[PDB]
Amino acid sequence: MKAMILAAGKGERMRPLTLHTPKPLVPVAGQPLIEYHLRALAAAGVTEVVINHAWLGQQIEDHLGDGSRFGLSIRYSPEGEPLETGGGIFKALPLLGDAPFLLVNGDVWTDYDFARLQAPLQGLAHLVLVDNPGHHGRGDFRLVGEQVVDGDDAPGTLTFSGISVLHPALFEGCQAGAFKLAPLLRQAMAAGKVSGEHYRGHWVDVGTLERLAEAESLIGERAL
Template sequence: MSKPKENSPLTAMVLAAGFGRRMRPLTDQTPKPLLPIAGKPLIEYAIERLAAIGVQKVVINLGYLGPKIRQQLGSGSRWGVDIHYSVEHEEEPLETAGGILKALPLIGDSSFLVVNGDVWCDYDLSQWIERPLPESCPGRLLMVPNPPHNPDGDFGIEGGLLSGTAKPRYTFAGISWLRAETLTEYPKRRECFGLGEVFTFNEDKLQAELYEGDWCDVGTPERLENLDRRLTGES
């Protein structure tokens, strides 16, 4: 795998503060990012892939059962990364954009990767590292074909850019490369809000790429079980 370029994002944020209500009772005592897939906590797959492309710092936001995530992952030394934790209130998650804004002092003011802690994907992010963001571009999103639980999709893609009107529509994969100012300069930013509205505000500016490989939003016990069977080679 090629070395990251000088202006590549060497910091990433993994979003891990959600309740995982749809995963109960599995998440009654275990935060969703720590649920095992083929014998390994789900979030560790993301950290391994980030480390493999040269990411040096990983910021993880903690909410529901957050101390268990910190205990499991520690400093990140076993992956060769430096893990920092942004602690949120366990009962009042800040959602995706709010969580990133709170963590920005740890992330820094440059561009950074964002990965949902409950997503499994085999996309090789080194392909992004080889194609830096243009100076005027607020970010890049990975899109996937619509899964059964999101049949209408989120956005279209037109000319390599995110579109609210283009067809067909695709599903946001939970993986992006953002500039800090995409959040800090969003006019409706507040303590608790989601990335979806930030993306909508930046339609026709954000780059978007369709990936048709292996991807799974591990949002229900059934999806968790299916992914585990696939990765362990069970029928």
């Protein structure tokens, strides 16, 4: 299947790093953050990637080009207005086609094996969930067997990893413009159409300098 990497975020919490460098292109261990995803995706057998962008977008295209150096074919979905995650995915659907695709929040650094998702999967969406960051119980969702439901307090909830397989039909109808992805996932969940899994390996949402350091720390433990 195809993959989409979300890369339209402005990274305001990463400043001043993101003043002249798009977040996707910030180096983590001598390598641009998004290039971990491109290499992982190519290793996992993915050959076609869609990347949306907004903030400093043309720098992303300039740097990655057509993706041939990664053994990929990349298409870009430029966004001129703030579309958010859901609206942005929707805007890119023409490039993705009608088949389920792998969706990867580009801000993430992880050792999750993307090739696990090319196995028989369940529903309109299949979500990779991880331990709640910061040692809290808030999270987003709960996982019962393979079935994902909406979170409830802090007894045993999990956090959405930003790694998933989505069915384009998830966006069936859908307000053409700017909207959120989570709300759509809960309608699917409400209909028993969302499966999931709990990944217990390394995962960092790289949204701050502190998260960047943590990712570097873990990446340095893997090299050894």
